[model samples]
Structure formats: C-alpha cells, structure tokens
Target: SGFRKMAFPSGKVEGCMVQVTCGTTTLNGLWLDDVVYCPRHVICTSEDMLNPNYEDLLIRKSNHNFLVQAGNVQLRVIGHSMQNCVLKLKVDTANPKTPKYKFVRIQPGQTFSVLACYNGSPSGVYQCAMRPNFTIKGSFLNGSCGSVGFNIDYDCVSFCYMHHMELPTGVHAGTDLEGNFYGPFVDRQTAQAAGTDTTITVNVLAWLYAAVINGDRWFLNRFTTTLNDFNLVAMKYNYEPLTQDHVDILGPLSAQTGIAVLDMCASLKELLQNGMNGRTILGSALLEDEFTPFDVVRQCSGVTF
Candidate 1:
C-alpha cells in the first residue's frame, strides 16, 4: 500500500460520525483560508463572476465543511462505513516537515487514537460534504450590488478569519450584525465600530433604482438626486441625516411638447377647416381629416411623437 505517512487523533466515534478534540477541550471554531474575490467570501475567479453557476447564504444548520486553526494539540480521525476513504486530511500551510500517512480502526461507535502536531496555529479543514456549484450572485449589470443579507457558510475562527486569508485590521469592509465571518466587517472591531443594520440604506437605493426602472424621465432625475445625497459618515449620533426620513418628490410631467394635445386637437379642426369639408364631412364613411391609421407609420418612422 502507498502509505502517505501522516497522523491524527480524533475522539470517541458515534456510529457514522466523528469528532476532533483538544485533549478535554474541543476546537470547532476553525477558520481555514477562504478563497475570495472583492466581497463574496466564497472561492471564485474572475470567470466565475460574468457567468455564475450558483450563489447562496448559509444558515445555522448548513451541512458544510469548516476550516479551522489550532496550535499544539493532538487530533483524532474517526470515519464511518459510509465515508469511502479513511481519515483523509490535508494540512494547508507552508512547512517542509508536514507529516504523512495515518489511520486507526474502531467499532461503528467506538474510539481511535492517531496523534498529530503542528507549528504555530496551523489551519486545515474537516471533510463534511462537497458541493461544487459555488458562484457569485448576478445583479450588477446597469448597477446593483450582489445579495444583501447573508450569514454565509465559511467559519470565522479568529479576527484573522477575515477574507481569503489576509486581514489588514479593517482596511476592507468588515463584518456586520448578521455577519459573514469571512468578509470585511461592516463595523470593524471597536467601541466606535461603524456598523448599521443596512435597513434604510438598501431601501433608499432600491427606491431610486425602481424610480428609473418603472419610469422614464424621473428615472434620470431621481437617480441623479439620490446619488447626489448618497453620503456616508463614520459615527453620527443621529440617524445619519436623510437615513431615517424619506424624501418625497413629485411625479414627472407627462410627455411635454410645444405641440400640446389640446393644441393638436385645435389644429385638427383648422387643418380640416372646422371639422367639415368635402373629404371629411361631405365624403363617405371613408372620409379623412389626415389623422389616418398611417399616423403611427409616419410618427414612428420619422420626426416626432
């Protein structure tokens, strides 16, 4: 057998389940490196952005693997009959002397002891189940940020558990009330940690966005207005100016033109000479006042509406 000589030491098994412990203590809050891009904490390349295959949020009981870090401790591996391979784990760190090969057998609900050690707080992951269709949320064509509220799946073991694996303190947008432990903090850690629930902010943006989408003229106007007032402040005691209040605006005036509909009506009479003429009144059911069905053809094909 090609023995990749390594070692591990998980705790007592429970029939098709396993656990890793730090002596009498357990270390579940593991934060392995998360492959990331700008904001989405999941591993994604540029190609994954233009056309995404899947995007989602993680709940409390999501069935997913978690990467964690630990220092100077013995680990245990307990595999069930269903898991095809034995205790298979890869230490994802830079080290020349990383170990190789290891396994210990036990009853369906029994115990095993495969000791393992590492330098510093080595990061690694435990296999749960694998799902490969991870992708970014598709919303930004004209201009829309991706999904708003998601706790997300990746674990956040330490403050270092921040983004793709580098935390310049809070250089990037950090966590939130409903936080994705992997991304930047909405309010980076501090008493004055600037964080908002994003309640009014999102709605306001959408309100203006819909203004443009459902309306024509006001879309441009409202879009410009909304953005002009789009100010971001650090720690305002009050509800950041326009944040708590809704600014109302009047609806756009419909299709303004020098040729008013009423003027057009009066013009019709003059054009047809007070609604009575050889072709309009004295003529048959096919009489004419120049407002023919072909009006659409002329209007659409050329000059004005």
Candidate 2:
C-alpha cells in the first residue's frame, strides 16, 4: 500500500520548560531553541515583540514525514480490512535511534483510533510511524509489514486547509430583473408601458434579416458560386424543407451570388422563436427611430397577425 504523511506545527513560546507527552505520559523536558526576533520589534524597540523563543515547533522527516508538537494529538486509522498492526514513533535525524513510541493491535474490519499528546523539547525533529504486522500466507502469517509516517506540525496543517473562491472574468454588468432587449422576456409591464414600440419592431426586423436577406444571400453564394447548382439543388430538396421549384430558383440565384441554401425555413424558424414580441416592441422603439426601418421590413416579411 502507498504511504501518506502530514506535518503539524506547535506554536509555543520560547524559553519555556516544556515536556513532551504521548498517551497521557510525559516524553521529554526540553528547552526551546532557535529564537526568532520580530523585524517590527527590532525597528520599533517594542520589548513585548522583542526576541521571542519557540513555544512549539513543527519538523518534517525524510521520506515525506512530519512532526507536530502540541498538547494533544490524535491518529485515526480507517479502512475496510485489517489483520493486525503495530504503531511506532522515532526521531528521524542524523542519529537513527528509536524514540519512545506506542503500539497497538488492530482488528480486521475495525477502526483503530489513538490520541497522543506531547510537549516541546530542545527543538528537534520527531516522527510517528505505524507498522502493519499481519499474515499474508496461504492462510495467515505475521512478521513486519508496511509502515506509515506522520509529522507534528499544527500550524502547517491549519494553513493547508485555507482556500478562497474566485469569481469569473468579464465586467460584472449587473443582472437585469427585467430581461434584455431580446426575448426570454422578463418585465412585461415595463416593456408594454414604454412610449416607443421597440420590442415588436426589433423582433420583426430580425425575422426579415434572417428569412429574406440573410437566407437569400446564403443560398446564392454558398450554392451557386462555390458549390455546383445540381449539388445545391439536390441538397435543398433532399435535406431542406424547400419545394423543388424553390430549389430550382435557388440554384440560379446561388450561381449568381456564390451562396448556398441549406435550410432557409429552419433558420427563419429559429430567428422567429428568439425574436422580440408585444411589450418588447415599445421598449426597443424608445431606443431609436431607425428601428422603424426594421419594423417596416418586419411587417413586409411573412409575419402573421
């Protein structure tokens, strides 16, 4: 199995006589070292913020391990299956000596949880280790197995969990309780009460642009100029909803304009569905008088009452 390690830093005061304990037992009576001075205090001559000693310390071990110095610490192991396991703690440093560690037998398919408390000592590195002693023979065998490591750093653990959510880009143009100029209409009263009739006009203009002008332009150019007229005709009749006669006319017009007519009716249907209606008419008209041309073209288009 793969191994996981974590470090926790104990923020303890310096020059304090601290004792390290695990599982309700004292581990060490160590003096704090590596006193750090605050730069602000150094500059401002504040005695309170002057030379400070370590109250607690966090150390990382080789093989990605960590040591957390706190009043209390808890380690919980959870998994589906487990035969039996033993836990250990060691000082991982230049001198490889076994430190005072604890061990317990874990039952299969059960949770093994342990809480250990320790105090700061002459600042150094410490590690928590776990050894899974189980049998994996034809039936069962027991000896030494995989190991897990942990660090004693509280501050580092707390810092790792902090995060912030980021907002999406683009100008935060505020939301509109009343919908925009287009359909998916929101405020019907506001739209209807507007002095100018913009909504209905804009909708009609879009329909005209899409159905007659854009549709004709696409048919003439893409079909006749670029693609062969027969191909364009076949495509229109076989794939599109246009009549055979319309295809014939489309072939010639496409030839002249270099446009292709795939499905003008379908495109027009989409434009109509998304176009502005009733109340939107007045709102849009209020925006500008030029919209009148759109209204006229829209009226001329095949718009039913």
Candidate 3:
C-alpha cells in the first residue's frame, strides 16, 4: 500500500524498479518532442472518430440545399476510450428519387476534403450518416461508440466569365442587353489616357445626366428627338451615330436623347475652356436651342434704327 515515486534518469532509481515509464512519461522529455496525447488512446478508433449519436454534425448555409463554391460542412465525434479504429461511411442512396446516401470510408484519423465540380449537376443536399463499424473487443475499451450525421449542400453558378473576364460568380447573366458586355481593353495606357481627357469626362457626365432624367416616359420622347438631331449632326461628320456598334463598343450605356444632347453640350463647355472642336459642337447642335431666336432677331429685316 506504499505510493510509488517515479524519477527521471536510471541513476535516480533507489532500488529495483519493476515498471519504468520513459519519453512522454518524463516531464522534460515530453517537451523534447512534440508528442501529442489522446485521452482515449494513442490511435483514434473508428467509433471515436465517427460517433453515431448524429447530433454534433453540422450542415452549413441552411438557406439552400446546395453549397456554392468554398462552402463547408463540419462533422465532429464525441466520446471516450476508443481510438486508432477505422471508420466506415455509407451515405444512404437507397431512395432513387433522391438517393439518401453516398459511400466514403475515412481512415483512423483523416479529414475529408470537398471540392466543386462542373461536368455534372453536383447540385443537391447530400445526407451523410456515419457510424463507427469497428469496436475494440478487449480490456480498456468498454464505452459504446456514438454516430454522427450531416448534410453537404451543393450549389453551382456560372463560371464561364473566368476565361474571358476575371469577374466574380453570378456577375453576368446568360442573356444581357446588346451593349451590356465589352471586350477587354487591349491598350491599358491608351485607355488610361482617354479616361483622363477633360472632353471625355464632360461628355460622360452629360451622358449620365441625360440618361438619368430621360429614364421616365414623360421625358423620354423629347430626349429621343434631341438625340435624333444630335445623331444627324454627328453623322454629318465621319463620327458614327450612337448606333449598335457604338453601344457595343461602350458596353451598357444610356442612349442619346435631347436631354442627353443638352447634357453633352454642357459637358463639352465645361471641358473646353476655349471651345470644343467644331465637330463636337456641331454634333451637339446646342446653338439652335440657345441662340436661334436671338440670331433671328439680330437678322430681322428693318427694325433697328
């Protein structure tokens, strides 16, 4: 009934030691190697890793059955005294309408990895019910192993944009407006320079203003009339009208209308302190709206003394 005292090094042994513990048993020796201690056992058992209780398993993103890319599901097992056992897994696929299971086996202690696939419709909620099929028969292994269950939701959005445009998933739709997409700009330097140009800035602002105001039906007709005139003038020169080609080149943008014409003229004036190129000014055709009546008065037949 005497207590046994354990000491480090053989020299510390007082008499004949019947049983001696080394390595992890020693205080400093445990620190020498990063030895991991398992409360159940050194090796994990299938029963320990795959608890059949099924309450601890978690399925993420309950909103949808399928998880989009980078989604994750976690499964945890809880119990004691069972380690170093293999786990056999079977996802019940018995139901043909929506197969209830998929089969996968995990080793003594291994993590399951998930990934996204495109070839087939990997879109569904997969139920995973795992059980610890193996149990220890000998001493020191008495507890009943628990079970774990979980669902892996899968979702798939479009990923084609990755090849042509480095855009996030679901950014682009299958059917977009005619001018909603544009090719990648090949000349970054030229694009940057165009962006900084004062004239382009003014034009863009004016266009945006016109687009905003003309969105309503009441203003749209008038806007269209002005846009037609502007287009006519722009076409008078070699500059193209705001045609499908232009829209296609520009990507999605509001169409040119009367209000848009006025907006462009305002923008032009802001950009060009001296005045814009005759081509842009004539294209805008702002003189008719601003000074037409005055010009007519000045040219009247015999009124002035």
Candidate 4:
C-alpha cells in the first residue's frame, strides 16, 4: 500500500486550524513534518472545532513521527475512543534515537499528558510552557487492525504566556479607616507578593477639565468662592492628589461621566457625549443599564453613600 505523507502549511497564522483526513484506506499511520508556526498551544482531535465527524482515527505503537518547530507548544489531542490512539513526543528529531516521552493515551476531551497544564494554575487558561525555544516531534500509530478514517486538527490555540500579577510599593494613594491601603503596583506578581490589591491613582486635573465640559454649571456651584482651595488641592497632590474619598465629592457633579477605579480618568467629554462611550464594553444599544455614580465608585473604591 502507498503511504500518504501529509504536508503541513508554512508560516501558519496563529489560531488557524489545519485539518487532515485519511479516507477508508488501510496502511501505517500518517507522517507529518516541518510544521513551523507561532502558537500558544497545539490541539489534536478527531473532532473538528465546529462539528464532529463519524470517523474513527486509529492509533498504535511508539514511533515518533510528527515534527513541530516553535518556541513553546502545549499539545492536546482527543480521539473517538479511549484506547484507539497512542502519541509519543520527543524534543530532538535529528537524533531519531532521542528519548521519547511516555505514550500519551488519547482521552476524550483531555490534554495530552506530557503537555497538560498544572491543576488550578493560571497556565490552564493562560497557555504556559516550560521550554523557552524548541521543536517537538510526535509519533502516532495505527494498530493496523483495519482501515479507519482519522482527523488531525492543529494550530488550535492563540498562544500567549501567562504572567502573574506584581505589586510595587506601599507609598500608595490612600489609607482608609478600615485598615485598607491603596497603592501602586508595577504588575500583578509584585502586588500579589506584597499582599496588596491593585488600585488606580486619581487625577484631579481631569476632573477640573471634565467639569468644564460636562458640569460647568455644577462646577461653579461647588467652587463659588474661588480657585483657591481647588488650586491648593491640585498643587498639593501635584494634580493627582485626590483619592476614592474625593471621587465621592466630585463624582456627583459629573454623573454622566463614568468614574470608577478602572475608569477613574476616562475621558469625560467623550463618555458624557455620544454613542461611542459609556459602557465598559463599547457599543450602542437601545436600552442598557448604565453604571450609576454610586454603583461605579462603591464597587471599585468601596465608598458608600
């Protein structure tokens, strides 16, 4: 019988699915090589992304046959039956004698054993990989029991590495009576390590600008006397002196503008004006509930009426 060698695409775009099908032909397992691409992870399955086919992909033996060149790849393969397929992976393909990983039985909807992410770790959602730069080869087998159809799907993921959050310092924005402190964080990992929740610093000048745009009448009401106190507050804090407490004071003057920990300095004129702004997720809807000032600040800054 003539063995059909399948060729993978070159420079495969991320998250593009490649499917291979072998009709009812009895032969040794298929061979695929030199698949180069940037992927968060690789997915192998008998089932397609959208629909399932009534094809039986057979697997057998411990021969390393598939080669993938990538920096980091997490492989996941699923088959129709529990024991129908066996996959062995190896790092070095040049030395066919290179050691192969233990045979990974294709289980239903489960990732391949060797490439599976750690339990309860962010890697499960974030596409974590150990190898910095490398190529992986896989050997798949067909028991030769009969001529059965098989489906191979690759490039199944939009690859991105996971990074833990970090917090930077205690010279935070504010301290509350409840023994909570809001501070600056370089990233998630440092913040998590420092045991501090991430918070955004407020810019008072943005509020001054937002007031002129959305609350000109309201602004004069609050600062009727002069720019004296406001200037002092602005200069003292270097234009970003206010915290959640002040978010409370100024938030009422500009109800149309959305203000929260995340949206603290969001463009008020834009948010208060047309169809482009408002919702955390941008879009136009006939009727959608907007975040009230109380809702926004209370949820994000823990400030209540």
Per-prediction TM-score, please? 0.19, 0.14, 0.17, 0.18
| Error of model 2, residue 17, in angstroms | 99
lDDT of 2 by residue, 57-155 (tens): 111112112222323432121211111111123222211122222222221111111112223323332222111111101110111001111122222
Model 1 lDDT per residue over 1-305, tens place: 11111112121110011122222222222212211011232322334434433232212112123222334433222211111111122333322222221222111111111111122222321211000111111111111111111111122111111111112322222221122332222212222232332222222222222222333212122112232233322112111233322222111111222222222222322322333233322122221211111221222233231
How many collisions per candidate?
23, 47, 29, 14
* Candidate 4 structure quality by residue, lDDT tens digits, 3-43: 11122121222122122222322221111222211110112
lDDT assessment of candidate 3:
0.21
- The candidate that wins on lDDT is 4
Comparing 3 with 4 on lDDT, the higher-scoring candidate is 4
lDDT ranking from best candidate downward: 4, 2, 1, 3
Which lDDT tens digits does candidate 3 get at residues 75-147? 1212111112211111211112222223233321111111111211121111111111111111111120111
Q: Estimate the overall C-alpha local distance difference test score of candidate 1.
A: 0.21
For model 2, the stretches where C-alpha displacement exceeds 4 angstroms are: 1-241, 276-305
